[PDB]
From a paper:
TAAs are a family of outer membrane proteins that adhere to host cell surfaces, and thus have an important role in virulence of these pathogens. In [name], [name] TAA is expressed as a 2757 amino acid long protein containing an N-terminal secretion peptide sequence, numerous head domains, a short coiled-coil domain, and a C-terminal membrane anchor domain. The [name] head structure exhibits a novel fold of an intricately interwoven trimer that contains modular structural elements from other trimeric autotransporter proteins. The structure of the head domain of [name] exhibits a tightly woven trimeric quaternary structure.
Author numbering:
A (entry chain A), B (entry chain A), C (entry chain A): 5 to 122, 129 to 177
The structure:
């Protein structure tokens, strides 16, 4: 009788503390023993959100569709980053060269080639690694590039209008 | 009495297994029925971490502030990636062109324009898609670009010092 | 006796609803009081997956090794994005300039330098910010860049073959 009272008090503490730990608006109802389902919002890649009613569904959505501000629309193999401090972003991206980035579907990394001259005094003649936007035969056109400084010191990229102008 | 014993044994198994499933250092106390709150670390965008005491808080922080090594500082609309295998990163980024990337706040994607000549024998004359660092009137200056190979085969970007040198 | 029945019914509802909220295939066994451990898949950076048997382990893996399609291979300090709407990706990346991107290990951002002429009529003469693939003395060679349009309007990046051709 005191034992019964002890149990119901304890199961209410169990219920409440499980509900607290879950968050997402979960609540415990001592009348039924039920924790109301949590609601966890995840961000789809198409400008919409999903409501998840379990932690596992939310975790799965995070991997399948990304997080807010970081979306890759794919079902293809995961990116692979094995280079030291390397970053691989998008389906089938591979960043195996150290201190490098592969970004874009199927992007790969190969070793940087130092270029000091070809015309001398090039800035950024000693690359730490590569920043790849694609792969051989699968190149990407880099777009919306502001005009870069044209100077001996400049490590800004140059755009097509600048090459147009010099010619 | 045996029924009571049965229940307390079972609620301890419920408590322990709920605590196990939660992780984050959650523990069950049979004396009170309470699961001690989990502690889940998330990574803020400002070089600090947050301690979350529910799964929902942690999930919400992951979306709001990013994950370790992947941070976008914003409260603006989510990125949208609807192109096949496309990647959209940052607030208001839109990657609707297939096999493309939009990266940076407000970046957009338009179709790649194949360029074989303008001067002939251009490498990377058949782009698979675009890698956008911005949008018309909202361009980004691409910086810290190492000198690229200057050769007929080269699909390296060129920097401003290289254009400076050739002129 | 009715009180006992009440409790076991309620603890089964507690068990089931905790198992539901957890997902990951967790199930409640009324015979033992045990919730079977959840299984949450996270994506490693090396082309493999991890099986996590707690929410906390899964959250920790998400931060340590990334999410599917978004991987940074590192144990170095977190990226920092403090610029308004800025994005910082990779270990030690810092995007403190507004509307900017730092991407790649140790990448930094400095203010964009508007360039209208150096040779006039440059497109993208008013950058909104920078897109940095590195830092001074730690530059990255940008690779697999498709040929950009060579025109007065062009904000496409140019590759080395294009500079080769014009020279």
């Amino acid at each position: 009788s005191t034992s019964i009272s002890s149990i119901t008090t304890n199961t209410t503490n169990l219920g409440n503390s499980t509900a607290a730990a879950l968050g997402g608006g979960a609540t415990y109802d001592p009348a039924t023993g039920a924790i109301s389902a949590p609601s966890y919002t995840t961000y789809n890649a198409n400008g919409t959100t999903a409501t998840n009613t379990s932690v596992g569904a939310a975790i799965d959505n995070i991997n399948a569709n990304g997080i807010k501000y970081f979306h890759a629309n794919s079902t293809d193999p995961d990116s692979v980053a094995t280079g030291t401090n390397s970053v691989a972003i998008g389906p089938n991206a591979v960043a195996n060269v150290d201190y490098s980035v592969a970004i874009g579907s199927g992007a790969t990394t190969s070793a940087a080639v130092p270029v000091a001259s070809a015309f001398g005094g090039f800035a950024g003649s000693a690359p730490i690694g590569v920043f790849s936007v694609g792969a051989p035969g699968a190149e990407r056109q880099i777009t919306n590039v502001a005009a870069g400084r044209i100077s001996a010191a400049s490590t800004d990229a140059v755009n097509g209008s600048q090459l147009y102008a010099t010619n």
